[PDB]
Structure formats: structure tokens, C-alpha cells
Ligand binder design. Structure first.
Ligand SMILES: CCCCCCCCCCCCCCCCCC(=O)OC[C@H](COP(=O)([O-])OCC(O)COP(=O)([O-])OC[C@@H](COC(=O)CCCCCCCCCCCCCCCCC)OC(=O)CCCCCCCCCCCCCCCCC)OC(=O)CCCCCCCCCCCCCCCCC
Ligand SMILES: CCCCCCCCCCCCCCCCCC(=O)OC[C@H](COP(=O)([O-])OCC(O)COP(=O)([O-])OC[C@@H](COC(=O)CCCCCCCCCCCCCCCCC)OC(=O)CCCCCCCCCCCCCCCCC)OC(=O)CCCCCCCCCCCCCCCCC
Ligand SMILES: CCCCCCCCCCCCCCCCCC(=O)OC[C@H](COP(=O)([O-])OCC(O)COP(=O)([O-])OC[C@@H](COC(=O)CCCCCCCCCCCCCCCCC)OC(=O)CCCCCCCCCCCCCCCCC)OC(=O)CCCCCCCCCCCCCCCCC
Ligand SMILES: CCCCCCCCCCCCCCCCCC(=O)OC[C@H](COP(=O)([O-])OCC(O)COP(=O)([O-])OC[C@@H](COC(=O)CCCCCCCCCCCCCCCCC)OC(=O)CCCCCCCCCCCCCCCCC)OC(=O)CCCCCCCCCCCCCCCCC
Ligand SMILES: CCCCCCCCCCCCCCCCCC(=O)OC[C@H](COP(=O)([O-])OCC(O)COP(=O)([O-])OC[C@@H](COC(=O)CCCCCCCCCCCCCCCCC)OC(=O)CCCCCCCCCCCCCCCCC)OC(=O)CCCCCCCCCCCCCCCCC
Ligand code: HEM
Ligand SMILES: CCCCCCCCCCCC(=O)OC[C@H](COP(=O)([O-])O)OC(=O)CCCCCCCCCCC
Lengths: 77, 188, 100, 127, 203, 225, 113
């Protein structure tokens, strides 16, 4: 359940044995969340609404940087 | 003091039956050989005797240096060195004399006296440096002569170690001639 | 100062030490001259009291005492944070046990 | 000795440790422009160079001539003296430029939050 | 013909007189490369320094500074002990310049070449060597004339991790000391008056 | 003699052998949860917890058998040349290690050996057990390795108390000197002698609490057969 | 009495310093807490070095061949060259300038062929 963007970054992360170490490559692998979208009026308003909703719903999710269900780790690799 | 003790032990090693005589002395004094070595080391450091063989102007500094050497030694935990020394002189009154009666150590001390102790040296005038330097040149000449005399007989590693100890003693006398000569006179 | 003496020293260095490990794919005379230039550029401080020939012989003798073949040497000043972290990351005691 | 102390004081102000340019800067700093030898006499320095609020033409002319002369000197020096160590300040400027290029390359493909996280972890490890 | 003369160098001394005549004829004719080859052969028959110098010059194809042929005209067996003051300086300066040019080329191709060589030489060196002062800058400009140029010296309290490139086992301390002592004795055979052993004594 | 270390070991054995701490008597849970939930620690943490209190679950005879097997295997593993070299390096880089809290290379290999030893001790003690997957010890996370290391036991160490007394000879004040001269002498003596002596004595205490005894020594002490 | 008091304070300080500098060698602590701290620090620094290397690998995999050669030179200099006194940034810039010479030749070809 990964994408091409994550896999391209995954091959180049070598000499990694434990998920703890791979936990330090979290925002680097978070770049697989490109969410490519235009900057039109509808998309810009939608982008603002969606990113604000993601910020507030990550507050209620309240997961630490160790437990990241939505950022693929050593299992997928 | 450590250089003098090592030199005496090394040149008593060459003499045969020296270990047997040392063990006999240890039995007569009711001590083990290691205890006898430590007792001899204590006997060597006799501050009162050290007082009679150095100029008073440099006695206190030399006294502090010898006390620091005792404190850094393996025998420094017994107590106040002076009192400790007195203890030996009250527990083994003849041992010091017996420490000269061993054949190897007797030879070592006689040759140490021959190399270093000369009537030309004025102890009260050893406070300066040029006196020490000229007498160190004389010591080096005497040490070379005695090394040749040793190399005449006993024909290696022991001789090399003896010569190295002689070089170290000469260098120490080059640095602090008054203190080194006071230590040698105190031992003798 | 004499070319005969220089060539005697070069012949001794080439006969005793294998300079081909120092520089790959080069002539022995050129490697010898390059090493002399490097030593004079870096170790000229000791020429006041130590002869250049003696210093070069000592350096080559130590380097080839390490190993007769090519070696890799890394320099770390462990008092610095960047050197210390590279000091422990780049070495592993297993290799030391294997004398690698 | 007192003579030794005086000699040490003299040597500690030698031109190779205390810059003669530093001494010139001190003299210019402590001396009024009317009591400054190098500038009081030359009205051209007191009016045309340092006396105008806006001196763009003079600045540009001086900079152009200095740039041409220093470019010529730099080309000459690069065409010769192939084996000589440069100054520490210039070498450190070059090192900073190369490191800045590498850091730009890193910043091109690395996200801001990831860079911040890595640098914060590195600083914590340093502490 | 001259190539056959090379075999005469490897053959007995009967052809040496004919070889000497051929060398004299070549010197009269002022040969460029054949003169270098004949000089190498003759100076390999006796000694090696002039022969190897001529071979090195031929390898760099040194057309200019052709004084070696003048050395080849010397009557002491197509050579001469205590070589001409012109050739000796020429040979020494040519060797040094070849070394410096090779160093510059290698440093430009690989900037870490000099650093690697210096680290390898300092890995097993005695600690006092490793506390040598760093090289200073002889350049000119505002610095060293008006400003101040700070030195390149550092602490130089370093640890050398020596790892074999091929993975082979490295020599222990006793083996390194034995190799050092062997080479020091061999150099003492070469140089009767040297203090190399003193360096072996670690200052 | 109520030796501190030996009596602490005997106290641990008394506490664990009383039967009050048998794991079958307890239902280990997460107390903080408002709903009763089982112990949700990691599998490696559970295994480390089980090995830490292996004596509580076993009787005296079974514990002695398993622990003797484990300790004999640990001794035979410590006799290997790699462990000897690691301990030689540990004894070698002692003074420098006394100058900083940053570990050198001579000690990180020792810590890796400690992790391997903890894994092997767990494998040896529970060998005859047939309801576990030792494969879970093949690849361990950093946290899992740290969890396993916490149960390391160097059984070759002297089990008696290492606390001891040393005599550092004292410089008596000289009546012929002034207060300032005596104070300078005391400061110089303190630094140049007591600081090396005290630091070396404390570092020696630490390393002797660290370095193990060679097998022959154990035989000479009758502690091994 | 004062000397004994000062030496007792010295004993406490020296024992505590030895604990702070060597407790990772022995298992006096029941759970090897000081040892685990040093092991964790080593793991963190090693992972930081590997993280630098992995960022380099990602950037290397995301660039063309010319920028790949340039990035190799720059990364090698950043890792090792900048920390070595005998490495010349002039030589590094010379290599970069040779690469730029080839790039400028290709640029001129594209401009005026
Ligand atoms: C060489 C150097 C070039 C430097 C940049 C120059 C840019 C000039 C404009 C280019 C526009 C263009 O060709 O767009 C093609 C683009 C097609 O997609 P593309 O070719 O792939 O390019 C998009 C990018 O790849 C990827 O971009 P994207 O897909 O993320 O979004 C593109 C972005 C493109 O937006 C921009 O480029 C904006 C910046 C350029 C205009 C700057 C104006 C500055 C004004 C200063 C003050 C002047 C005041 C005048 C009076 C104001 C009175 C209120 O479009 C928007 O943000 C949506 C439009 C929002 C603004 C207009 C809303 C309606 C206004 C009606 C009146 O079409 C659009 O973007 C449609 C909207 C264009 C709006 C233009 C401005 C009106
Ligand atoms: C240099 C720059 C300045 C000069 C202009 C350069 C050329 C810019 C335009 C051409 C560039 C280009 O590639 O455009 C792509 C653009 C299509 O790509 P797009 O930007 O993805 O458009 C998709 C949506 O329409 C994008 O629309 P949306 O999904 O963002 O929603 C906008 C929509 C809804 O937004 C709103 O209601 C927001 C509030 C009003 C915003 C009004 C703007 O706005 C309205 O309903 C406007 C209502 C106006 C009043 C009632 C009639 O091409 C055209 O729209 C073709 C016609 C316009 C170009 C020719 C005239 C240019 C002036
Ligand atoms: C620009 C950057 C955009 C974001 C880039 C990173 C990104 O997209 O990360 C995705 C991020 C990674 O999640 P994760 O795997 O939990 O990460 C673990 C850590 O939180 C580690 O992730 P993180 O929290 O570090 O990153 C998430 C991101 C999320 O934040 C954002 O995306 C916010 C971006 C706009 C900020 C606007 C601020 C101003 C307005 C405020 C109102 O937060 C940040 O980037 C940190 C703050 C950034 C600066 C804010 C300055 C203000 O979130 C997701 O992938 C979630 C998407 C789906 C959500 C499903 C519903 C969850 C809640 C339901 C309850 C929980 C159920 C869980 C069940 C699990 C067992 C079955
Ligand atoms: C009360 C009795 C006594 C009275 C007198 C007391 C005098 C006390 C000292 C007064 C002067 C120093 C004051 C503290 C430092 C202030 C400047 C500073 O922090 O500069 C740091 C730093 C460079 O200073 P540095 O630590 O000497 O750099 C080391 C060099 O890389 C390598 O070092 P280097 O020696 O090779 O560098 C040559 C040296 C040459 O220095 C001069 O020519 C200075 C002449 C005027 C002195 C006033 O410095 C420069 O060329 C630096 C140029 C850029 C900064 C200006 O520059 C900056 O922070 C940025 C400057 C602007 C961008 C370039
Ligand atoms: C006030 C304290 C300031 C501390 C500055 C750094 C020194 C330091 O702490 O060293 C420890 C430690 C020593 O490590 P090291 O490997 O031995 O030394 C590396 C160097 O420090 C060099 O560090 P590097 O190799 O990591 O270079 C990157 C470094 C420095 O990056 C820069 O300076 C980049 C800006 C350009 C600098 C050069 C401009 C001119 C270039 C051309 C010149 C010739 C023309 O970046 C930072 O310091 C922070 C990241 C950049 C800013 C935040 C993200 C923005 C997006 O360095 C760090 O931990 C560096 C990161 C520190 C980040 C947090 C700082 C918190 C300060 C809190 C103070 C209370
Ligand atoms: C408009 C005509 C003049 C021009 C273009 C001129 C130009 C200059 C320049 C270029 C400098 C050197 C400044 C620098 O490079 O930093 C200088 C210095 C100087 N000028 Fe003039 N100047 C002029 C008139 C005068 C006059 C009339 C006097 C005498 C009153 C004078 C006295 C000086 C002095 C004393 C210096 C300092 C040089 C030294 O001390 O070695 N100048 N001038
Ligand atoms: C070329 C580099 C020279 C050093 C830097 C000069 C540039 C300074 C500058 O920005 O010009 C603005 C100021 C105006 O003075 P102010 O009133 O704004 O303080 O400066 C002026 O316009 C006038 C004063 C400086 C003119 C240039 C003099 C430097 C060259 C002469 C040798 C000392």
C-alpha cells in the first residue's frame, strides 16, 4: 500500500535494520504525501480547508513520532 | 632513592649466593624477603641522617622531596616516615648493619661509594650548580671505568640495566646534585 | 647535493620498499621524486636536527611495517564531536579482533 | 627582568601579530579629520571622496579599476605559483562557498521540517 | 646496428672497445635518442646513475639540454666519474621538476592524494613527528603586508585508524618493530654515519 | 562474614524462592487503564521480564540445574579468543576512559558482546523449553537490544563485595613553613598525587567490577569444576 | 579534622566521577541503566551518520549524470575534505571548473549550432 514516490526514497535508504532507525527518516519518507494539486481558486480554498482539517485531525489522532500507521516503514520495504 | 635501590639490587644480582644471604638475613630478622626489601627501603630513608649530609639551606626542600618520594612509594602507607624509620631502629637494631653484611649489597655499596663519594666534593658547596656539573662529569668518568671493570668479568642484560641505572643517577645528579648526593650519603 | 648520492638513496628505497603501493601506475623514479617533494613540503621542520634521508627512511619503514600492501588510514581528533562520531561509526572492534 | 618585559611588550606589537593596518585604523578612529595627517591636507579626500553623501560615480570608478587590476593579478597568479598555500581567510571563504553549494543541493531535495528535525537532533547529540 | 651493440653490452668485454668506438662515432654524429640508449647501456655496464638518468630523460623525451651527449664523449669508458657540473645540476633539477609536476598533476586530479600520503606516513610515525607545526602560507597581498595572516596550526592530537584496503591481516606491534629494526639495520649498512636508530628510539 | 554482594544475592534468592512471586499466581495487567487489559508490553520485554525472574517460577533444584547449565555455557563462551581480546582492550584503555564519559571503541565492542551474551543466556536457560521462538532474537531493534541488555549477568565476576579501603599517604604540615606556603604545597600535592591516585583507585574499582576472572582462577578458588 | 573532612568530600567526588565516566563498563546498576545510555548514544550517532549517507544516496539517485558527478565531488568534500588541512578547496574548485567547462561547451553548442 505504498506509491512510486515512497519506493524511490525507500531503495536509497540503506543500512537500516530496525524500525526505530527508520523512524528518524519520517519527514523524508513523508514526502511521498506530495498530494499534487493545482493552485486554482477552488483548489487553493480546498487546499487550505484540507490542510487545516489535517492539522486539527492530527491533534485528535495525537500519535507520537514512534507510532505512525500512515507512514510506511520496514514492513513495506 | 628508587634508582639507588634498583642499582644496588641489580649489582647484587651478579654476585652469586646473594639471594641465599638475603634469605638468611630475612630469617634472622624474622621477616619474608619482600618484608626485608621494604625494611631496607625504610632504612635508606633516614631524614636525620639526611639532615647531616646536606646544606640546611636546602634541607627543607629536600626533606619535602624525600617525603613525597616516600608517599609515592609502596611503603608510604606505614605511617610517618621518620617515626616509621625509628620503629625499624627499635625493632631491628642490627638489620641496617646486616644490610651491609650481605656480599652482593656490600659490593654494590662499596662500588657506589667509589664512583660517587670523593673527598674533593664539598657538601656545603653542593648547593650551587657548577660544582654539581663538574662532579657529574667526574661521576661519568668513574662510571665508565667501573662499567669497563664489570665487562672484564661476567662474560649482559643485567650489565645493560646497571649502566642505564648509572646514567639515570648521573642525570638526576645533573638536575639536583645536592639532593642526589645527600641521598647517596644517607644510604651509605 | 650529488646526483650519485641521490641515485644511491633512490636505489636503496626502491630495493627495500615497494613504492608502487604509494602511487598506482607510475614509474619508480617519479614516485621517489614525488615522495621526496611531499616529505620536504610536510616534514621540513625536522631537517634542522634530523637528516632528510633518515627521516624518509623512518617514515617508509614505519608505513611498510604497518603492511606491505595498500592501506587506508583515517585520522580522528576524538575531542571534537564530528570526529568522535566518525571515530566510532567507521570502526568496529570485530575488525580489530581479526587484525584488519 | 624589566628589560625583558620591555622587549616582550615591543615584540607583542610586531607587525606580524598586530596589524599595521590595525594601527592605522586606531589612528583614524582616535583622530579628528582636521587633525588626521592622511586626510586633513587632501581636501579631495575630505570633500570629494569622504565629504559627499552620495558618491556613486566615484565609488563605481574606483571599484571598476580595482576589479580590473585584481582580476589581472589573479589571472597572473593562477597562471604561476602552482604549488603554494594560500591565506587562511581566502581558503575559508572558498570552503564556505563549496559547503554552501552542497547545502543548497541538499535543500533542493530535502523538506524544511526534515532539515529542522535533523539539525535539532544533531544539536541535542552535540550537547 | 646499435641495437646489436646493446647485446654487446650484455655480452663479453671483447666488443667493449668496438662499443667505445661506436659511442665515439655517435657522439661525433650528435645522436638524439640512440645516444640516450647507448648512454643507458654503457652506464649500466658500469654504475647505474648516469644510465638511469639517461633512461628517465628519454622517457620524458628531453630534446633540449642535450649535454648528456657531451658526457657521453668523456673518455673514461664512454662515461666519467664526478660528472660534469652542467649535467649534475641539470639531472638534479630535472628530477625535482618531474617530481613536482607529477605531484601537481596528481593533486589536481585527486585533491586527497597528498592528504592520504601524509596520513599514511604519519600513521605509524612516532608521536613527536605528529606534533610537527603545519605549513604556513608564503603568498602576498594585503595579508602579511598590512593585515595579519593566521597560521594553519591545529591541536594535532589525533587517532589513526589503519584499515587494509584488501582486507589482509595487519602486522602487530612486535612485527612492526621487527620490520622497522630490520630496515634500520639495512640502512645502517648503506649509511655508516646515520642517526636513524635514534629515531627508532622514539626521540 | 555478611559480605554485601553475596548477602544481596542470597536475599534475592530468598525473595524469589519464597513462592510469593510465582507468575502463575498473578494476572499481569496495565493498571493505569480504566478497563482491565492484559500486559501490553513488547514480546522482547515480556521475554526479558520472564528471564529476570526465572528463579520465581522455578523450584530450587530446577533453577540450580538450568542456571548451572547456563553459567557453564557462558564460561565456555567467555574462553573464546574474541572475548579475551575484548577484555584485554577493556583493561588497556582504562586511564583514557577515566578522562571522559564518552565511550571509546574498546568498549562499544564490549557492549555489543554484552548484548550477544544476554541473548545467549536467555537461549541457554530456556533451551529445553518448547513454547517459544528464538528466531525473534535474530534481528532486534535498538529498543529491544537495550531491553535484553538490562538482564546481562557476568557470572565470572567475583560475587563477593568489591568495596574496599586504600591508604593514600598524607603530607604532614611542616611547622617551618607559613600558611600560604603550606597551602600551596597541599594544593600541589593534592592535585599531582591524590588526583591520579584517587582517580586510578576509583577506575580500578569500576574495571574490577567489570572484568571477569579467568577460568583457571576459578579453579584455583574452587568456584568451578 | 578539616583535612579528613576535605578528603572525604574528595572521595565522594572522585567516586561519583568514576561512576559518571565508567559505569557502562560494569553491571553494578541492576538494569544496566548507565550502560544502556552509552549504547543508545552510540546508536543515535551511528544512525545520524547513516542518515547523512542516506540523504546523499537519495539526492544521488534523483539527479542526472553531470549533476551526479558534481554532487559526488561536493559530498566527498563535505564529508572529508573540509575537515582535512591538506585538502585544497582550490583543487576542488578546479575539478568543478573542468565540469563547468564541459557544461559551458555544451551550452554554446546548444546556443549556436
Ligand atoms: C520566465 C519567468 C516567468 C515568471 C512567472 C510569470 C507568470 C505569468 C503568468 C502566467 C500565467 C499562465 O500562463 O498560466 C498558465 C496556466 C496553465 O498551467 P501551466 O501552464 O502548467 O502553468 C501552471 C504551473 O505549471 C503550475 O502552477 P499551478 O497549476 O499551481 O497554478 C498556476 C497559477 C498561475 O498563477 C500565476 O502565475 C500568478 C502569478 C502571475 C501573475 C502576477 C500578477 C501580479 C500583479 C501585480 C499588481 C497588478 C495589479 C493589476 C490590477 C489588479 C486589480 C485588482 O494559477 C493560479 O494560481 C490560479 C489563478 C489565480 C489568480 C487569478 C484569478 C482570476 C483573476 C481574474 C481577474 O494557467 C493558469 O495558471 C490559469 C490562471 C492564470 C492566471 C494569470 C493571472 C491572471
Ligand atoms: C501575465 C498574467 C496576466 C495576463 C493573463 C494571461 C493569461 C491567463 C489565462 C490563460 C492561461 C491558462 O493556461 O489558463 C488556463 C485556463 C484553464 O485552466 P484552469 O486555470 O485550470 O481553469 C480551470 C477552472 O476554470 C479554474 O477555476 P476555479 O476552479 O479556480 O474556480 C473559479 C470560479 C469559482 O471561484 C469563485 O467563485 C471564487 C470567487 C470569484 C473568483 C473570480 C476569479 O470562478 C468563477 O466562477 C468566476 C465567476 C466570475 C463572475 C461570473 C461570470 O484557461 C482558460 O480559462 C481559458 C480562458 C481564459 C484565457 C484567455 C483570457 C485570459 C485573460
Ligand atoms: C506542509 C506539510 C504537510 C504535511 C506533510 C506530512 C504528512 O502529510 O503527514 C501525514 C500524517 C502522518 O500521520 P502519522 O503516520 O500518524 O504520523 C505520525 C506522527 O504524527 C508524525 O507525523 P507528523 O505529525 O509529524 O506530521 C503530520 C503533519 C500534519 O499536519 C499537517 O498536515 C498540517 C499542515 C497545515 C498546517 C496549518 C497550520 C495553521 C492552521 C491551524 C488550524 O504534522 C506536521 O507536519 C507537523 C506540524 C507542521 C507545522 C505546523 C505549523 C502550525 O498524517 C496522515 O498520514 C494521516 C492521514 C489520514 C488521517 C486519518 C484519520 C486520523 C484520525 C482518526 C483517529 C486515529 C485513527 C488511527 C488508527 C491507527 C490504527 C488502526
Ligand atoms: C585596551 C587595550 C588594547 C586596545 C586594543 C584592543 C583591540 C581588541 C581587538 C579588536 C579587533 C577585534 C574585535 C573582535 C572581532 C570583531 C570582528 C569579528 O568578529 O570578525 C569575525 C569574522 C572574521 O574574523 P576572524 O575570526 O578573524 O576570521 C578568521 C579568518 O578566517 C582567518 O584569520 P586571519 O587572521 O587569517 O584573517 C585576517 C584578518 C585580518 O584582519 C584585519 O585586517 C583587521 C584590521 C583592522 C582591525 C581593527 O581578518 C580578516 O581579514 C577578517 C575580514 C572579515 C572581518 C572584518 O567576520 C565576521 O563576523 C563577518 C565580517 C564581514 C563578512 C566577511
Ligand atoms: C547561537 C548558537 C548558534 C549555533 C550555530 C552552529 C554551531 C553549533 O551549535 O555547533 C554544534 C554542532 C557541531 O557539529 P559539527 O558537525 O562539529 O559542526 C558543524 C558545523 O556547525 C556546521 O554545521 P552544518 O554542517 O550542519 O551546517 C548547517 C548549519 C549551518 O548552516 C548555515 O550556516 C547555512 C547558512 C549559510 C552559511 C554560509 C553563508 C556564506 C557562504 C559563502 C561564503 C563565501 C562567499 O545549520 C544550522 O546550524 C541549522 C540549520 C539551518 C537553519 C535552520 C533550517 C532552515 C531551513 O553543530 C550543530 O549542531 C549544527 C546544527 C545546530 C542547529 C540548532 C542550533 C540551536 C542553537 C541554540 C543556541 C542557544
Ligand atoms: C584635487 C587634487 C588632489 C588629488 C586628486 C589628490 C589625490 C590623492 C589620493 C588619491 C591620495 C591617496 C588616498 C588613497 O589612495 O587612499 C592622496 C593622499 C594625500 N594627499 Fe592628495 N590629492 C589632491 C590634492 C592634495 C593637496 C592639495 C594636498 C596638500 C594639501 C594633498 C595631500 C595629500 C596627503 C598628505 C595625502 C596622504 C598621503 C600620505 O600620507 O602618504 N593632496 N591624495
Ligand atoms: C568599493 C568598496 C569601498 C568600501 C565601501 C564603500 C561603499 C559604501 C557605500 O555604500 O556608499 C555610501 C556611503 C555614503 O555615506 P553615508 O552618509 O551614507 O554614511 O559612502 C559614500 O558614498 C562616500 C564614502 C565612501 C566612498 C568610497 C571610498 C572608498 C574608496 C577610497 C579608499 C579609502
Amino acid at each position: 500500500q505504498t506509491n512510486k514516490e515512497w519506493w524511490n526514497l525507500a531503495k536509497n535508504i540503506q543500512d537500516v535494520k530496525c524500525q526505530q532507525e527508520l523512524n528518524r527518516y519520517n519527514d523524508l519518507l513523508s514526502q511521498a504525501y506530495t498530494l499534487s494539486l493545482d493552485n486554482t481558486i477552488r483548489n487553493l480554498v480546498f487546499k487550505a480547508k484540507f490542510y487545516s482539517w489535517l492539522f486539527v485531525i492530527n491533534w485528535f489522532k495525537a500519535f507520537p513520532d514512534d507510532f505512525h500507521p500512515f507512514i510506511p516503514g520496514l514492513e513495506m520495504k | 632513592w628508587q634508582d639507588l635501590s634498583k642499582f644496588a639490587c641489580l649489582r647484587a644480582s651478579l654476585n652469586k649466593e646473594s639471594e641465599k644471604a638475603f634469605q638468611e638475613l630475612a630469617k634472622k630478622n624474622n621477616v619474608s624477603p619482600q618484608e626485608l626489601v621494604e625494611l631496607s627501603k625504610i632504612v635508606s630513608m633516614n631524614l636525620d641522617v639526611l639532615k647531616q649530609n646536606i646544606n640546611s639551606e636546602q634541607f627543607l626542600l629536600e626533606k619535602e622531596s624525600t617525603l613525597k618520594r616516600y608517599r609515592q612509594s609502596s611503603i608510604g602507607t606505614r605511617g610517618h616516615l621518620q617515626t616509621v624509620n625509628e620503629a625499624v631502629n627499635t625493632k631491628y637494631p642490627t638489620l641496617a648493619e646486616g644490610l651491609g653484611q650481605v656480599a652482593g649489597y656490600k659490593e654494590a655499596y662499596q662500588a657506589l661509594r667509589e664512583i660517587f663519594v670523593h673527598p674533593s666534593i664539598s657538601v656545603n658547596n653542593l648547593r650551587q650548580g657548577s660544582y654539581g656539573q663538574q662532579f657529574a662529569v667526574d661521576f661519568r668518568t668513574r662510571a665508565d671505568e667501573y662499567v669497563k671493570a664489570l665487562l672484564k668479568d661476567h662474560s649482559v642484560q643485567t650489565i645493560q640495566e646497571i649502566q642505564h641505572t648509572l646514567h639515570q643517577i648521573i642525570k638526576n645528579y645533573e638536575q639536583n646534585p645536592a639532593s642526589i648526593y645527600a641521598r647517596i650519603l644517607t644510604v651509605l | 647535493i650529488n646526483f650519485k648520492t641521490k641515485y644511491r638513496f633512490y636505489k636503496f628505497i626502491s630495493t627495500n620498499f615497494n613504492l608502487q603501493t604509494i602511487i598506482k601506475n607510475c614509474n619508480d623514479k617519479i614516485i621517489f621524486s614525488t615522495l621526496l617533494y611531499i616529505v620536504n613540503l610536510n616534514y621540513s621542520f625536522f631537517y634542522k636536527t634530523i637528516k632528510n634521508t633518515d627521516l624518509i627512511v623512518y617514515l617508509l619503514a614505519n608505513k611498510f611495517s604497518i603492511l606491505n600492501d595498500n592501506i587506508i588510514v583515517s585520522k580522528f581528533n576524538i575531542s571534537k564531536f564530528n570526529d568522535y562520531i566518525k571515530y566510532i561509526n567507521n570502526t568496529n572492534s570485530i575488525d580489530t579482533y581479526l587484525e584488519n | 627582568m624589566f628589560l625583558g618585559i620591555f622587549k616582550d611588550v615591543i615584540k607583542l606589537l610586531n607587525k606580524k601579530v598586530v596589524p599595521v593596518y590595525f594601527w592605522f585604523f586606531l589612528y583614524c578612529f582616535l583622530s579628528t579629520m582636521d587633525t588626521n595627517i592622511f586626510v586633513s591636507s587632501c581636501s579631495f579626500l575630505k570633500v570629494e571622496v569622504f565629504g559627499k553623501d552620495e558618491n556613486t560615480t566615484l565609488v563605481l570608478l574606483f571599484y571598476v579599476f580595482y576589479s580590473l587590476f585584481n582580476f589581472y593579478l589573479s589571472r597572473i597568479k593562477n597562471k604561476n605559483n602552482y604549488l603554494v598555500r594560500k591565506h587562511l581567510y581566502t581558503t575559508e571563504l572558498l570552503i564556505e562557498l563549496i559547503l554552501f553549494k552542497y547545502k543548497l543541493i541538499i535543500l533542493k531535495f530535502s523538506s524544511i521540517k526534515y532539515i529542522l528535525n535533523f539539525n535539532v537532533r544533531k544539536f541535542i547529540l552535540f550537547n | 646496428a646499435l641495437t646489436v651493440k646493446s647485446e654487446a653490452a650484455l655480452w663479453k668485454g671483447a666488443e667493449q672497445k668496438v662499443l667505445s668506438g661506436l659511442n665515439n662515432l655517435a657522439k661525433t654524429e650528435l645522436v638524439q635518442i640512440t645516444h640516450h640508449f647507448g648512454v643507458n647501456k654503457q652506464g649500466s655496464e658500469a654504475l647505474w646513475s648516469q644510465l638511469d638518468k639517461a633512461a628517465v630523460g628519454a622517457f620524458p623525451e628531453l630534446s633540449v639540454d642535450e649535454t648528456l651527449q657531451l658526457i657521453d664523449g668523456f673518455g673514461e669508458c664512454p662515461d666519467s666519474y664526478t660528472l660534469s657540473h652542467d649535467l649534475n645540476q641539470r639531472l638534479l633539477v630535472s628530477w625535482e621538476q618531474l617530481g613536482k609536476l607529477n605531484f601537481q598533476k596528481l593533486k589536481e586530479t585527486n585533491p586527497y592524494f597528498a592528504s592520504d600520503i601524509v596520513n599514511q606516513l604519519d600513521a605509524a610515525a612516532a608521536e613527536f613527528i605528529k606534533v610537527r607545526p603545519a605549513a604556513e602560507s608564503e603568498a602576498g597581498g594585503f595579508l602579511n603586508s598590512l593585515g595579519v595572516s593566521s597560521s594553519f596550526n591545529t591541536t594535532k592530537n589525533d587517532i589513526y585508524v589503519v584499515q587494509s584496503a584488501s582486507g589482509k591481516k595487519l602486522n602487530n606491534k612486535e612485527q612492526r618493530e621487527a620490520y622497522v629494526l630490520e630496515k634500520a639495520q639495512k640502512y645502517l649498512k648503506e649509511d655508516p654515519q646515520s642517526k636513524i636508530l635514534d629515531i627508532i628510539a622514539q626521540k | 562474614p555478611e559480605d554485601e554482594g553475596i548477602e544481596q544475592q542470597l536475599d534475592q534468592q530468598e525473595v524469589l524462592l519464597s513462592g510469593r512471586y510465582d507468575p502463575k499466581l498473578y494476572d499481569f495487567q496495565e493498571g493505569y487503564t480504566k478497563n482491565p487489559e492484559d500486559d501490553q508490553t513488547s514480546l522482547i520485554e515480556k521475554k526479558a521480564f520472564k528471564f529476570r525472574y526465572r528463579l520465581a517460577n522455578e523450584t530450587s533444584e530446577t533453577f540450580q540445574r538450568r542456571n548451572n547449565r547456563m553459567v557453564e555455557r557462558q564460561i565456555k563462551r567467555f574462553q573464546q579468543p574474541q572475548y579475551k581480546h575484548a577484555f584485554e582492550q577493556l583493561q588497556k584503555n582504562i586511564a583514557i576512559s577515566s578522562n571522559s564519559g564518552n565511550a571509546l571503541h574498546s568498549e562499544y565492542g564490549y557492549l555489543e558482546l554484552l548484548s550477544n551474551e544476554s541473548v545467549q543466556l536467555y537461549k541457554d536457560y530456556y533451551e529445553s523449553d518448547a513454547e517459544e521462538d528464538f528466531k525473534v532474537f535474530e534481528n532486534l531493534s535498538s529498543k529491544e537490544k537495550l531491553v535484553m541488555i538490562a538482564n546481562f549477568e557476568n557470572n565470572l565476576l567475583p560475587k563477593y563485595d568489591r568495596s574496599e579501603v586504600h591508604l593514600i599517604p598524607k603530607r604532614q604540615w611542616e611547622p617551618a613553613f607559613g600558611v600560604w606556603e603550606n597551602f600551596l604545597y597541599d594544593i600541589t600535592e593534592y592535585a599531582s598525587f591524590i588526583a591520579p591516585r584517587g582517580k586510578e583507585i576509583a577506575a580500578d574499582y569500576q574495571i574490577q567490577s567489570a572484568i571477569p576472572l579467568t577460568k583457571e582462577e576459578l579453579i584455583e578458588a574452587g568456584l568451578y569444576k | 579534622a578539616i583535612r579528613n573532612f576535605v578528603f572525604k568530600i574528595s572521595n565522594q567526588i572522585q567516586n561519583l566521577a568514576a561512576k559518571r565516566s565508567l559505569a557502562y563498563l560494569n553491571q553494578i546498576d541492576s538494569q544496566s541503566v548507565p550502560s544502556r545510555a552509552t549504547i543508545n548514544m552510540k546508536d543515535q550517532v551511528t544512525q545520524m551518520q547513516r542518515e547523512i549517507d542516506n540523504m546523499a544516496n537519495v539526492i544521488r539517485a534523483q539527479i542526472p549524470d553531470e549533476d551526479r558527478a558534481e554532487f559526488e565531488i561536493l559530498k566527498k568534500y563535505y564529508v572529508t575534505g573540509q575537515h582535512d588541512s591538506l585538502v585544497d578547496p582550490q583543487d576542488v574548485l578546479l575539478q568543478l571548473d573542468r565540469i563547468q567547462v564541459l557544461k559551458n561547451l555544451k551550452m554554446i553548442e546548444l546556443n549556436e549550432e
